[PDB]
C-alpha cells in the first residue's frame, strides 16, 4: 500500500512537470528568437551588405 501511493504521487507530478517544461520551452524559444534578431540587429556597422548577411 505504500508504493501503491508512491506510484500515483509520482505520476501526478510527472504529468504536471511535463506541461511545465513545455511552458519553459515556449518561453525559451521566443527568447532565443529575440536574442537572435538582436544579435542580427547591431550588424549595421557595415553598409547594406552587412545588414543582409546578418
Amino acid at each position: 500500500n505504500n508504493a501503491s501511493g508512491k506510484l500515483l504521487a509520482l505520476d501526478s507530478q510527472l504529468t504536471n512537470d511535463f506541461s511545465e517544461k513545455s511552458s519553459y520551452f515556449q518561453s525559451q524559444v521566443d527568447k532565443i528568437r529575440k536574442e537572435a534578431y538582436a544579435g542580427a540587429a547591431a550588424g549595421v556597422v557595415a553598409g547594406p551588405f552587412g545588414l543582409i548577411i546578418s
Partner: peptide
C-alpha cells in the same frame, strides 16, 4: 595605422554593443 583603426573599431563595436544592451534591457 590600419591595424590601429581596426583595433579602435573593435572597441567601438564593443561599446556600441554595451550601450545597445543597456538600452534594450530597459
Amino acid at each position: 595605422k590600419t591595424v590601429e583603426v581596426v583595433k579602435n573599431a573593435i572597441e567601438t563595436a564593443d561599446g556600441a554593443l554595451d550601450l545597445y544592451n543597456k538600452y534594450l534591457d530597459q
